[PDB]
Amino acid sequence: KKSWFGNFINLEKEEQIFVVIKDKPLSSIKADIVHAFLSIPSLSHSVISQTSFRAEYKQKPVKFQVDITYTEGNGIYSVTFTLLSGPSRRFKRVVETIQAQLLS
Amino acid sequence: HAQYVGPYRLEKTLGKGQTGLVKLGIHCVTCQKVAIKIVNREKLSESVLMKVEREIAILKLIEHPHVLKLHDVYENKKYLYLVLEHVSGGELFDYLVKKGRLTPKEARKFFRQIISALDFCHSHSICHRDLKPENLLLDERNNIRIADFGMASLQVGDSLLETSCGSPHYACPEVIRGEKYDGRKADVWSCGVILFALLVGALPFDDDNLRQLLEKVKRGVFHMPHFIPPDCQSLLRGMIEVDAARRLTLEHIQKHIWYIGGKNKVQIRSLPSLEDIDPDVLDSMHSLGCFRDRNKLLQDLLSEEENQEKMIYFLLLDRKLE
C-alpha cells in the first residue's frame, strides 16, 4: 500500500512517518534501527530512551527522532520518525532506508 | 489478524454496498479516528485515476467548514483506500425523516451551508457531479460536511458486476443523457432537488419504473406544493430548470431574496518563464503519479489557459509563504 500524498505536502504541525511492524519483538526492532543507523556513515545517533533514539545526518544537517510504541491487539509495534530540523527531502530518504531494514 | 492502511488499523464497517464500503480506521499511535472508503480499482483506467488524483490534490490543499476533509489516499493493485475525516452525526436525511419536513428557516440554514461549500469548491475548479443525500453528513454540531467532492469518477459501486451509474433522482437531464455538461450547472440542479426534499419531505421526480423516472427528469415537470412560499418556489424553479443555459448560477442563487432572508483564496497569476517556477513546489508536484511527465507539467504551468496544474502550483506556493 503506497500513499499518494506522502511526498506532496505536510498539513500537520510535525512532519512524521509511521511504520507498523507485525512479527518482531522490541529487541529485533531496536536491532534493525541501529543496524540501519550504522549502515549510514554520514549518520551518527544516540540512545535517549529505552524506546527512542536521536539521529543526525550530515547545507543543513537533518536531525530527527525515532520512537517505538506498543499498539494494543499477540504484539504489534509502530515506529515513529519525527523530523526535528533539516530539509524534508533528505529526511524522507534516510527514513526510507531505515524503514526498508525494518520491513525486512 | 489485524489489517492496516498505513498507520490506520481497520475496525468495523461504517458503510457498505452502494456508495461503497467504508471502514473505521484507528491511528496506531494517536488513536485518532478516520473513515476509510475502500474502492476497487481493477476496472478504472489510468487516465481516470490521474484525473481524480489531480482533483484530490486540490481538495487536500483547501479547507471549508462544510467540506468533509481528506487526509490521504493509499493504493495497491486491487484497491484505493481513501482516508477521510470521521464525523459522528449520521446523514442530513436521517434528520428529515424524524421531522417529515423542515421549517423554511431550517431548510434555509442547511441550504446556505451547502451553497457555500459548492461555491468554494467550484471557485477552486472542483465540481461534485453526483450530489446526493448520502453525501450530506452531519458533524458534532449538526453542521453539514459534504462527502465525495472529486470522486464521481471512482464509481464506487455496490456490485462488482454492475457499474455504478449515479443516483438519477438527483441528476440533471444533461447528466442523464450522457451529454457533455457543466459540472457547476449539474451541482445546481442537484442542489435544487435536495432543497425541494428538505422543504417537502418527498422528491420532485419519483417513479416505480426506472424508464418513467428518467422521462420525468428530462421533462422537468413536477408539482410545487402550495405551502411553499412564492419566492422560494421561484428559486426552486430557477435551479430545477431543464435548459442548462437558463438554469441559475450560484451567484444568482446567493442574490435571491429567499436565500438572503428578510431578518436584516488562492490567486492565480501567470508564469512567464521557467526561471520563475519554484523548484521545491515542482518537486512536490512531481511526486504525484498524475505528473510523471515533468515537461508536460511545465508546459501546463507556462501556458495561458487556467488549469488544475496552476491551481495546485499556487496552492502549494502560498502554502510555502507561511
Numbering used by the authors:
A (entry chain A): 519 to 576, 585 to 599, 606 to 636
B (entry chain B): 13 to 276, 287 to 344
Q: Any passages from the paper?
A:
Despite the diverse functions, the AMPK family members display similar structural organization, with an N-terminal kinase domain followed by a non-catalytic region containing an ubiquitin associated (UBA) domain and, in some cases, a kinase associated (KA1) domain. The C-terminal non-catalytic region of SAD kinases includes two short conserved regions, SCR1 and SCR2, which respectively contain the characteristic UBA and KA1 domains12731. In this study, structural and biochemical analyses of mouse SAD-A revealed a synergistic model for the autoinhibition of SAD activity by two separable elements, a newly identified autoinhibitory sequence (AIS) and the UBA domain.
To unravel the regulatory mechanism of AIS, all the AIS-containing fragments in complex with KD-UBA were subjected to crystallization trials, and the complex structure containing the AIS-KA1 fragment of residues 519–653 was determined to 2.5 Å resolution. The UBA similarly binds to the kinase domain from backside, and the AIS-KA1 fragment sits on the top of KD-UBA. Comparison of two KD-UBA conformations, in isolation and in complex with AIS-KA1, revealed that the AIS-KA1 binding does not induce a large rearrangement of the kinase domain, and that the major inactivating effect is likely due to the influence of AIS on the αC conformation. Consistent with the trans-inhibition results, the non-inhibitory KA1 domain makes few contacts with KD-UBA. Contrarily, the AIS sequence, adopting an extended conformation, makes many interactions with both the kinase and UBA domains. The following Phe526 and Ile527 stick into an adjacent hydrophobic pocket formed by residues from three helices, the kinase αC and the UBA α1, α3. The conformation of AIS is further stabilized by multiple hydrogen bonds, directly or water mediated; in particular, Trp522 and Ser521 from the AIS interact with two acidic residues Glu87 and Asp84 on the kinase β4 strand.
